[PDB]
């Protein structure tokens, strides 16, 4: 007989997982200007959607960690910004945009030769809980750039990890059966419907 503390809701959703990956190449066309906007979503971790869609309503806080390095994995002398844009505010559209110097958007200046940064974001919904199903969930945005006027001398990659804390859930649902097709859409391929599990030749044979 094991313990019942392994199946609480704060153990099911309890670890930091990779939810984002921002690429800042020295050349090419991915992010030609040394900045990028990433919208906060929890389905960046591939296993999170089926886990959270077991319930209709959820309520939690989040903790974010930023790990940055060169594509090889090297550590270089660079400074970055990591701005947070709350839901309802304009987002940057250039390196000279005035949104980078708005005091109501919190920022975290940090070096690459530093331990990864870490911040906490509260529950930001206008309602009492988030809902993954609405018959009839904006959290914010993280903007990443390199501090300075000229372009950076190194190629950089930024990885974002999220951990959910103080979790509450209501009204369980059946777990997902079929492959997903879209985001924020329960649509499924109607020409190829598969059974829940595996089959056997006859009902009287093991």
């Amino acid at each position: 007989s094991h313990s019942t503390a392994e199946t609480t809701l704060d153990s099911f959703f309890s670890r930091a997982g990779l939810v984002g990956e921002i690429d800042l190449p020295l050349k090419g066309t991915t992010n030609p200007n040394g900045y990028a906007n990433w919208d906060i979503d929890i389905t960046g971790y591939a296993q999170m959607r089926r886990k959270v869609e077991l319930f209709t309503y959820m309520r939690f806080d989040a903790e974010f960690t930023f790990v940055a390095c060169t594509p090889t994995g090297e550590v270089v002398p660079q400074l970055l910004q990591y701005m947070f844009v709350p839901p309802g505010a304009p987002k940057p559209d250039s390196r000279e945009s005035l949104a980078w110097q708005t005091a109501t958007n919190p920022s975290v200046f940090v070096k690459l030769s530093d331990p990864p940064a870490q911040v906490s974001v509260p529950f930001m919904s206008p309602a009492s809980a988030y809902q993954w199903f609405y018959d009839g969930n904006m959290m914010g945005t993280f903007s990443v750039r390199t501090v300075g006027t000229s372009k950076s001398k190194y190629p950089l990659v930024v990885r974002i990890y999220m951990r959910m804390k103080h979790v509450r859930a209501w009204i369980p649902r059946p777990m997902r059966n079929q492959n997903y097709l879209f985001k924020a859409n329960p649509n499924y391929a109607g020409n190829s419907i598969k059974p829940t599990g595996t089959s056997r030749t006859a009902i009287t044979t093991l």
Partner: protein
């Protein structure tokens, strides 16, 4: 018997509304209704719901079917909040196995449900409170839940007996509020 959804009674036009009768056939797949959309053009409740800006209510649902002792089959009646699909006459299911939403039917008993076995009983009663993330909402822009009546065991009979079995739904609002 009577089941109370999630162990909660409704709390803070209140009459019986009997809908049109469905015909259960040998090849039926299932039906569903959406609330409050099922009652938005019928009577005083429907007049109240299209002229007020905020709405809040619970419900009491009765499902009935009369058949003889030489018929057989079984139905599952369940209530699913925020039933997103991937009037007063309802809709039919295209792929009942996935509940038309990509989720298995075999786990639908995780919701407030009842069984109608033609050899045992012919009635099912479910009491549903108000469920939302908001104290009030709009009766014309949001459907709070859906009602499902799906045959798990097919209807069977011998030739010469009646080939269609009627299913009747009668429902009453409970603790309805308007503003």
């Amino acid at each position: 018997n009577i089941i109370v959804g999630y162990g909660e009674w409704p709390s803070y036009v209140n009459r019986f509304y009997t809908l049109d009768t469905k015909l259960w056939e040998k090849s039926s797949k299932g039906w569903y209704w959406k609330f409050p959309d099922v009652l938005t053009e019928t009577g005083v409740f429907g007049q109240n719901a299209q002229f007020h800006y905020l709405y809040r209510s619970g419900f009491c649902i009765h499902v009935q079917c009369n058949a003889s002792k030489f018929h057989q089959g079984a139905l599952l009646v369940a209530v699913l909040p925020e039933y997103v699909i991937g009037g007063a006459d309802g809709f039919e299911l295209q792929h009942p196995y996935v509940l038309d939403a990509g989720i298995p039917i075999s786990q639908l008993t995780v919701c407030p449900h009842q069984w109608i076995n033609l050899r045992t009983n012919n009635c099912a009663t479910i009491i549903v409170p108000y469920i939302n993330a908001l104290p009030f909402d709009s009766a014309l822009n949001h459907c709070n839940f859906g009602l499902l009546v799906v045959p798990i065991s097919p209807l069977d009979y011998d030739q010469g007996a009646t080939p269609v079995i009627p299913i009747t739904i009668t429902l009453a609002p409970m603790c309805s509020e308007f503003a």
